[PDB]
């Protein structure tokens, strides 16, 4: 239970909601040409350089 | 049944017991699996489908028997002693009880009038100096040398 401030928690929330797959409708729109994403990650890896 | 693990965890939470204390009826498996909420788990608990198994303690009767024998003074010999004499009976505690007994005896004697102040001072210092083993020894010395103002 490390204690974050408002901005630190906001940046963690941004990282969390960035950690999402590309939408299937986006894949359909791009015709399976944008399927990947540079901000995908896992929580148990090299940590965020955000906090 | 699918996983009853969620139901078992919720039931352990509702009963305040450990996870393995929770007993789920192996016949009412679909009845348990239908239970999703705390209220459903409480209903199963009240109707007996879910219950907390009895705690299996540690019985103490065969230690009570040994404690009774040790109170009587048995099962406590040299072959049973393993800590040092001093770890089993602290010397300050021994001295404290001895000196307090002697002091209370002298106080009661001076209160009831068997002991005047002049000899009381010397007897108190003798006791503080360890001349007397116990209240019985003190009384024996008093009766031997006639220190009590008998009447």
């Amino acid at each position: 239970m490390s204690h974050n401030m408002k901005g630190q928690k906001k940046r963690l929330a941004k990282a969390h909601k960035q950690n999402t797959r590309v939408p299937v409708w986006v894949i359909v729109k791009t015709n399976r040409k944008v399927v990947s994403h540079p901000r995908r990650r896992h929580w148990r890896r090299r940590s965020l350089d955000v906090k | 049944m699918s996983d009853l693990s969620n139901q078992r965890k919720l039931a352990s939470k509702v009963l305040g017991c450990g996870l393995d204390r929770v007993w789920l009826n192996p016949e009412a498996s679909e009845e348990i699996a239908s239970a999703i909420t705390r209220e459903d788990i409480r209903g199963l608990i009240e109707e007996g489908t879910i219950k907390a198994k009895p705690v299996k303690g540690v019985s103490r009767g065969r230690a009570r028997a040994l404690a009774a024998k040790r109170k009587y003074g048995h099962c406590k010999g040299h072959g049973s002693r393993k800590g040092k004499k001093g770890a089993r009976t602290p010397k300050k505690e021994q001295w404290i009880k001895k000196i307090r007994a002697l002091r209370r005896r002298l106080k009661e004697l001076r209160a009831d009038g068997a002991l005047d102040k002049s000899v009381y001072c010397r007897l108190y210092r003798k006791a503080k100096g360890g001349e007397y083993r116990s209240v019985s020894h003190l009384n024996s010395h008093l009766e031997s040398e006639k220190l009590l103002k008998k009447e």
């Binding site: 906001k10 929330a13 969390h16 | -």
Partner: protein
Amino acid sequence: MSSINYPFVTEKAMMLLDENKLQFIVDTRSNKKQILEDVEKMYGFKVKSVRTMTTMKGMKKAVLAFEEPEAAHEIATRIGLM
């Protein structure tokens, strides 16, 4: 600048209607005083208390407890929740 974004309609948020509380997604810049005054201006109901938390979506949620009975139901009906 309105602090109230919109009523928050999830299962737990709908559970507030039966205790006369109403949950809102609000501006994270604003505070409890601004949220209370803005809600009172918006719906004409006297607010008894405001509870606020920040989420991991970067949002701020406020549960408002009203003073008038049925005020939460009436605001939900006015919005279109009920």
